[PDB]
Design a protein around this motif. Structure first.
Motif, PDB file in Angstrom:
ATOM      1  N   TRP A 100      -1.493   2.054  -8.908  1.00 44.49           N
ATOM      2  CA  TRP A 100      -2.083   2.134  -7.589  1.00 44.49           C
ATOM      3  C   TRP A 100      -3.593   2.171  -7.752  1.00 44.49           C
ATOM      4  O   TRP A 100      -4.076   2.895  -8.615  1.00 44.49           O
ATOM      5  N   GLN A 101      -4.333   1.384  -6.969  1.00 43.18           N
ATOM      6  CA  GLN A 101      -5.783   1.418  -7.096  1.00 43.18           C
ATOM      7  C   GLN A 101      -6.475   1.028  -5.792  1.00 43.18           C
ATOM      8  O   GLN A 101      -5.831   0.687  -4.805  1.00 43.18           O
ATOM      9  N   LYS A 102      -7.809   1.111  -5.815  1.00 46.32           N
ATOM     10  CA  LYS A 102      -8.630   1.108  -4.618  1.00 46.32           C
ATOM     11  C   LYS A 102      -8.863  -0.307  -4.091  1.00 46.32           C
ATOM     12  O   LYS A 102      -8.965  -0.485  -2.881  1.00 46.32           O
ATOM     13  N   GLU A 103      -8.929  -1.291  -5.001  1.00 50.20           N
ATOM     14  CA  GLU A 103      -9.414  -2.631  -4.695  1.00 50.20           C
ATOM     15  C   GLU A 103      -8.306  -3.503  -4.109  1.00 50.20           C
ATOM     16  O   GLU A 103      -7.343  -3.834  -4.789  1.00 50.20           O
ATOM     17  N   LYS A 104      -8.493  -3.913  -2.853  1.00 45.94           N
ATOM     18  CA  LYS A 104      -7.560  -4.789  -2.169  1.00 45.94           C
ATOM     19  C   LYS A 104      -7.530  -6.151  -2.860  1.00 45.94           C
ATOM     20  O   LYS A 104      -6.486  -6.805  -2.895  1.00 45.94           O
ATOM     21  N   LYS A 153       0.831  -1.187   0.000  1.00 48.24           N
ATOM     22  CA  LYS A 153       0.000   0.000   0.000  1.00 48.24           C
ATOM     23  C   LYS A 153       0.877   1.252   0.000  1.00 48.24           C
ATOM     24  O   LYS A 153       2.001   1.233   0.496  1.00 48.24           O
ATOM     25  N   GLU A 166      -3.989   3.068  -1.013  1.00 48.87           N
ATOM     26  CA  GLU A 166      -4.205   2.344  -2.253  1.00 48.87           C
ATOM     27  C   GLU A 166      -3.292   1.118  -2.282  1.00 48.87           C
ATOM     28  O   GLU A 166      -2.300   1.044  -1.560  1.00 48.87           O
ATOM     29  N   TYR A 167      -3.664   0.145  -3.117  1.00 40.73           N
ATOM     30  CA  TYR A 167      -2.995  -1.140  -3.175  1.00 40.73           C
ATOM     31  C   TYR A 167      -2.289  -1.252  -4.519  1.00 40.73           C
ATOM     32  O   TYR A 167      -2.731  -0.691  -5.514  1.00 40.73           O
TER      33      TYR A 167
END
Length: 312
Positions: A239-243, A225, A230-231
């Protein structure tokens, strides 16, 4: 009248204005466009003319002009770059006032094989205005050439030309290495090479028991992260929101694992799967990517221990 221009100390010369104008009292003579180019008083002449021809194949002397410069520039390069990131590059030069005197004028770039050129990205601008004519563009995987039409370059005389283009850092990009490109400018009068450099970063890790670090733990699984929460997803990176779509790094048989291909910054591991016999801590485990956080000239920097508590 065959107007002719010579550098201070030849070629035809358009845009020269010629005007045409017994007393019993040589000693009297001296007391009195492209059709191809440059076809008696010389009344007005191009800025390039230092000394006009004497009033009468007229002969004109050119001003002195410096050879055009080359700057190569990478934007926003201080923190390095992620693998997959679209790095923004600039070749800057100055179309000289006497560009009609050149025979060749070629801009080109050549990058290390871990920088992949985005060929649709190449855009010539002059004085901020896009230019799409008067050149042939040839692209290779790690470079391009723009060969300019001398004739067309005259409308940009004494103005700045920049070539913007993007290159993407490939996943073969080793952290903590100089990743080069050489911009070039080739005329019949001179050659200029300018080098630039980019880099990506990384962090090695080893998973260990929290009391005894000589106990290395396979099969531990992490995701990464940023400070935004972000992951990291592979798509190079993004980089994005969804784990759920996070890239998952696993400790190997030596407990060792790493992230390669990040810019400088503060990040976090989040364990999603504990080694057998150990607790799953979900607290963010901080680490820093910085110059030499991965290696120094191929010598790998010691791994950061990630500690696991053995279960009661």
């Amino acid at each position: 009248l065959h107007k002719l221009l010579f550098p201070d100390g030849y070629r035809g010369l358009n845009d020269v204005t010629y005007q045409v104008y017994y007393q019993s009292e040589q000693e009297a003579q001296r007391q009195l466009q492209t059709i191809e180019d440059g076809v008696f008083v010389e009344a007005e002449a191009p800025e390039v003319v230092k000394e006009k021809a004497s009033n009468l194949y007229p002969k004109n002397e050119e001003n002195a002009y410096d050879l055009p410069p080359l700057e190569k520039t990478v934007l926003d390069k201080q923190q390095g770059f992620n693998q997959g990131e679209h790095i923004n590059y600039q070749l800057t030069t100055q179309i000289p006032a006497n560009i009609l005197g050149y025979q060749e004028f070629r801009l080109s770039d050549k990058a290390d094989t871990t920088l992949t050129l985005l060929p649709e990205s190449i855009e010539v601008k002059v004085a901020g205005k896009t230019v799409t004519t008067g050149y042939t563009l040839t692209t290779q995987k790690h470079g391009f050439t723009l060969d300019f039409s001398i004739k067309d370059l005259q409308n940009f005389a004494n103005q700045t030309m920049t070539v913007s283009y993007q290159m993407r850092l490939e996943k073969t990009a080793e952290p903590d290495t100089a990743i080069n490109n050489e911009g070039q400018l080739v005329t019949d009068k001179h050659t200029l090479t300018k080098r630039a450099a980019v880099r990506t970063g990384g962090k090695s890790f080893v998973k260990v028991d929290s009391e005894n670090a000589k106990i290395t733990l396979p099969e531990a699984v992490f995701i990464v992260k940023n400070q935004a929460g972000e992951y990291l997803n592979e798509t190079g990176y993004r980089w994005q929101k969804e784990k759920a779509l996070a890239k998952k790094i696993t400790s190997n048989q030596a407990g060792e694992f790493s992230v390669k291909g990040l810019k400088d910054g503060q990040y976090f591991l989040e364990e999603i799967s504990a080694p057998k016999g150990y607790l799953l801590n979900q607290t963010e485990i901080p680490f820093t990517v910085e110059k030499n956080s991965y290696a120094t000239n191929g010598q790998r920097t010691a791994p950061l221990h990630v500690i696991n508590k053995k279960v009661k």
